[model samples]
Target: GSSGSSGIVLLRGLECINKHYFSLFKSLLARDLNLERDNQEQYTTIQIANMMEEKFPADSGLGKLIEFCEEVPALRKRAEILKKERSESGPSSG
Candidate 1:
């Protein structure tokens, strides 16, 4: 199949995003998988990565996101639950 430059550019952008994300998490990830009760604010991170995965699974962007999510099952499960809840929420009314 012929590949488009737009797709390539988008993938490159994903790589850049993945790189930054890993760099930010590298220190924390090396230290611990679980966030203390007081550190719960960090949980919203999964929303970005998981939402990308949900929206762009086949894109080259999601490879690292899926791998990172897999590295910590707890986070993955959290994302899964949140995603499930979101799906069940249905459409909103104005």
Candidate 2:
């Protein structure tokens, strides 16, 4: 099978996202996951990663991630170009 992309980058991108942005509560996830919580934060990173997947459309793109990659200016230009690309078609020779 041809790989479009491994999805690892996207995965980690999401991981990176909730890690810094959402600041998900491990006790929240722990109650959900049946894991025990310490006074310290726990599993927030991975839990938030899964939380992202669960919240959004399972088979979709850009809206959730693109809505976010804004928090990440580094990825902003790439997404910005893509947003424009969707507005392009048939103007160029195929």
Candidate 3:
């Protein structure tokens, strides 16, 4: 019960972050890089990560965002593994 509202707030915050992150990526990819609408999807995450690496200092906001975006897949994979482990453990008996 203690985490109820805070959990919602955290979810909302993450949602906002995702929106802004994607917006920045799209704007940079389209307007700055001159990527056509149809071709934007062809851009891979690794490509975006590399571009961000070259475009900004690693300690900068944009660089951190790029790192976050690049780590998403790995994080999902880790979550999946943890979920699988939990299911296999069949809840705590103690």
Candidate 4:
């Protein structure tokens, strides 16, 4: 397949979310991702999207989900490790 092992890493990411971070994802879905509506330390959509270094569909539930995924230490660290093993095994979307 053209995707190679990226699929495996992606699956693990989803598994982690379903297994442990489900609450975070749920919270994000209701979040505005706008300005100062949720928390004082919260990042706006632009800030999170910019830091993530891409322009994926800037709204809907996706952007909020991604921000929460990136914000979570466990999920973030897991992704970093996934990228490592994933790169060692095959190609990347990055």
Top candidate by TM-score: 2
Model 3 Cα lDDT, one tens digit per residue, 13-71: 12334444555555555664465677666665455555544554432224334334455
What's the lDDT for all of these models? 0.42, 0.46, 0.44, 0.45
lDDT of 4 by residue, 1-94 (tens): 3655545432243444653465454344434433244552353334443432343342323434444566777667655654454344455469
lDDT tens per residue, model 1, 1-94? 9876433332332243344454444334334433344553444445344444555564323443434544565447534433333333554578
The sequence of per-residue lDDT tens digits that candidate 2 reaches over residues 13-58 is 4443445443333333345444555632545545545664565444
Q: Which residues of candidate 1, in runs, are more than 4 Å off?
A: 1-58, 78-94
**What is every candidate's alpha-carbon RMSD to the true fold?**
13.6, 9.2, 13.8, 9.9
Using lDDT as the measure, the top candidate is: 2
Candidate numbers, best TM-score first, in rank order: 2, 4, 3, 1
TM-score of 4: 0.34
| Greater-TM-score candidate between 3 and 4 | 4
Which residues of candidate 3, in runs, are more than 4 Å off? Answer: 1-24, 58-94
TM-score of each: 0.23, 0.35, 0.33, 0.34
Which is the better candidate, 1 or 2, if ranked by lDDT? Answer: 2
